[PDB]
Ligand binder design. Structure first.
Ligand SMILES: Nc1ncnc2c1ncn2[C@@H]1O[C@H](COP(=O)(O)OP(=O)(O)O)[C@@H](O)[C@H]1O
Length: 512
C-alpha cells in the first residue's frame, strides 16, 4: 500500500464503464479532493473508479484448455451501443485457462476466468485490471508511421497529415470560441475511441463541458459522442498534483483501448498558466518527451496478430501572446505535426484558420503510400504542386506590398488567381455545413485534380495569348467554388471535362 521508489502503486482501473465517465487527474468520478507531493509518493481520498454494482453482459471467447498470453482476448462485453469492450488477459500473465464463466451477467469484481501458469500458480481474472499510470503498457512492436489518421479536414489531411500513432500540437484553449477544428478532430477522426483531457479551468470553459457533451452527437452513428469517449477534467478547483498526473492517466487509458485493437485519439488540453517549482528546466522537458513517446501504432500483446493505435493531439498555450518559452518550444521539439491556428486568418474569416506557411507535418512521406495505393496514385505530386503554388503566391504578395499590382504580367496574375481558388475552394472548409463538415479522401483528391487541372489549363491559355480576364470569368470557375458543397464525387469529377471544353471554346475564339 505504501512503499519506496516512484509512488507505491499510483494506478488506474480498466474495464467496462470507462466509457461515458468523467474523471479527475487520478480517476475519481465527478469532482473529489486533494493529493500532494510526487517525485517520491502520494496520498489520496475516497471514490470508486468503476461501479461494482452494475451488471455487464459477458460473452466468453475462449474455452477450458486454451493456452493464453498477456493481451489475449478471453471475452467481449457490449459496453455502449458503439463500443464492444474486449476482455484481455493482463500483461505478465500466461498459461492454460482452467476455468471460464459462461455467458451471462456479472459485476466487475466477479471472477470470470482462471489461468494456471506454467509453474502451476492459479491466477484469477476479472473484467477489469489495474495498471500503474507511470509505466507504458507493453506491446510487441511499435510500427513506423504509415497510415494517416483521417480527419476529413482538407488542409490537415492534404498538407499537414497526422499518422495513426502520431503526435500533433495545436494552439490551446480547446474551449476557445475563435476556432472549431479542435471539435472537428474529436468527432471526425477515424479513431474508434477518444480520450479527452479538457483542462478548461474557469467559467465559460467548464460548465459547457457538463450537459452539452451528453447531447453531442457522434456524426458517424447518430448516437452520443460520450458513448466512445472518456472525459478527464482538469479544473482550477483541483490540486496541482492530480492535474499533472491527468495526462499519464489519460494515456494509460488510451493504451488500454489500443491493446484491444482500437485506434484511439488522445486530446490533451492546456491553459495559460503558472507552472513553476533532478537538474531542472531541462528535466520536465525530458519527461514531456517521454509522455509523447507513449504515442504510437503497435502490434499489441496477444496470440493473434493485432494492431491498435494511440494518436496524440496536444493543445499549446503560452503564458503571453508569444509562442516562446514554457510549453511551446518544448512541445514543438517532440511533436511531428503543428497546426498553426492563426488569429489573423480567423479575423479574415478564412476557416479552418490554419496558417499554411507556418504549419508542418513530418508525416507526409510516411503516409503517402497509403494514399497512392488506396485513394489516388498522384496524391503527393498534387499536394506538393499545390503547396508550391501557395509558396509562390506568398512571395508574390510580399513583392506586391512593396511595388503594388499594376506591373504584374498576365502569368503572375494567373498564379494569383489560381492560388486564390486553392485558398477559397480547397483550404477553406465549412464545418457548419451538412456536406462540407467532412470531406472523404476520395473527394479531397478529386477536388484537388479539378483545381490543378484548371491551373494547367490556365497557364496553357496564358501561354497562347488568351487574356486572363477571359479565364477569370470562365463559367466553370463558380462551379469549382461550390464543389465542396457537392456530395456526389462523380459530379465533381465531371468538372475536369467541363473545364477542358470551356477552355477549348476559348482557344477557338482566339485562334489560339
Ligand atoms: N467551417 C469551419 N471549419 C473549420 N473551422 C472553423 C469553421 N468555422 C470556424 N472555424 C474555426 O475558426 C478557427 C480559427 O482559429 P483562431 O481563432 O485563429 O485560433 P487562435 O486561438 O490561435 O486565434 C479555425 O480553427 C476554425 O475551426
Amino acid at each position: 500500500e505504501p512503499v519506496v521508489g516512484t509512488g507505491a502503486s499510483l494506478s488506474v482501473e480498466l474495464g467496462p464503464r470507462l466509457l461515458t465517465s468523467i474523471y479527475d487527474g487520478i480517476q475519481r468520478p465527478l469532482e473529489v479532493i486533494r493529493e500532494k507531493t510526487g517525485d517520491f509518493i502520494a496520498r489520496g481520498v475516497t471514490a470508486p473508479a468503476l461501479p461494482r454494482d452494475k451488471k455487464w453482459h459477458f460473452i466468453p471467447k475462449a474455452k477450458v484448455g486454451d493456452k493464453v498470453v498477456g493481451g489475449d482476448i478471453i471475452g467481449e462485453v457490449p459496453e455502449t451501443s458503439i463500443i464492444v469492450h474486449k476482455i484481455m488477459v493482463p500483461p505478465g500473465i500466461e498459461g492454460e485457462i482452467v476455468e471460464i464463466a459462461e455467458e451471462g451477467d456479472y459485476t466487475i469484481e466477479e471472477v470470470i476466468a482462471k489461468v494456471k501458469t506454467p509453474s502451476g500458480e492459479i491466477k484469477e481474472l476479472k473484467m477489469y485490471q489495474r495498471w500503474p499510470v507511470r509505466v507504458k503498457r507493453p506491446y510487441k512492436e511499435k510500427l513506423p508511421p504509415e497510415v494517416p489518421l483521417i480527419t476529413g479536414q482538407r488542409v490537415i489531411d492534404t498538407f499537414f497529415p497526422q499518422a495513426k500513432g502520431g503526435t500533433a500540437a495545436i494552439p490551446g484553449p480547446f474551449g476557445s470560441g475563435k476556432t472549431v477544428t479542435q471539435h472537428q478532430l474529436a468527432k471526425w477522426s477515424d479513431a474508434q475511441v477518444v480520450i479527452y483531457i479538457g483542462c478548461g479551468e474557469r467559467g465559460n470553459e467548464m460548465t459547457d463541458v457538463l450537459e452539452e457533451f451528453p447531447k453531442l452527437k457522434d456524426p458517424k452513428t447518430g448516437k452520443p459522442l460520450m458513448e466512445r469517449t472518456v472525459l478527464i477534467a482538469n479544473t482550477s478547483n483541483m490540486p496541482v498534483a492530480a492535474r499533472e498526473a491527468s495526462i499519464y492517466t489519460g494515456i494509460t487509458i488510451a493504451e488500454y483501448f489500443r491493446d484491444m485493437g482500437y485506434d484511439v485519439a488522445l486530446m490533451a488540453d492546456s491553459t495559460s498558466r503558472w507552472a513553476e517549482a533532478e537538474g531542472y528546466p531541462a528535466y520536465l522537458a525530458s519527461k514531456l518527451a517521454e509522455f509523447y513517446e507513449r504515442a504510437g501504432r503497435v502490434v499489441t500483446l496477444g496470440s493473434d496478430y493485432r494492431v491498435g493505435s494511440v494518436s496524440v493531439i496536444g493543445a499549446v498555450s503560452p503564458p503571453g501572446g508569444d509562442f516562446s518559452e514554457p510549453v511551446v518550444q518544448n512541445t514543438l521539439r517532440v511533436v511531428k505535426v503543428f497546426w498553426a491556428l492563426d488569429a489573423d486568418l480567423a479575423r479574415r474569416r478564412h476557416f479552418p484558420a490554419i496558417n499554411w506557411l507556418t504549419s508542418y507535418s513530418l508525416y507526409v512521406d510516411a503516409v503517402k503510400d497509403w494514399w497512392h495505393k488506396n485513394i489516388d496514385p498522384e496524391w503527393k505530386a498534387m499536394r506538393d504542386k499545390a503547396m508550391a503554388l501557395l509558396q509562390k503566391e506568398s512571395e508574390l504578395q510580399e513583392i506586391v506590398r512593396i511595388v503594388g499590382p499594376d506591373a504584374l504580367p498576365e502569368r503572375e496574375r494567373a498564379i494569383l488567381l489560381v492560388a486564390r481558388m486553392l485558398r477559397e475552394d480547397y483550404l477553406q472548409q465549412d464545418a457548419f455545413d451538412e456536406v462540407d463538415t467532412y470531406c472523404p479522401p476520395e473527394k479531397q483528391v478529386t477536388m484537388m485534380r479539378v483545381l490543378l487541372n484548371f491551373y494547367d489549363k490556365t497557364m496553357e491559355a496564358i501561354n497562347r495569348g488568351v487574356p486572363l480576364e477571359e479565364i477569370a470569368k470562365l463559367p466553370v470557375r463558380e462551379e469549382i467554388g461550390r464543389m465542396k458543397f457537392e456530395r456526389d464525387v462523380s459530379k465533381i469529377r465531371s468538372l475536369i471535362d467541363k473545364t477542358n471544353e470551356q477552355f477549348e471554346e476559348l482557344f477557338k475564339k482566339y485562334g489560339a
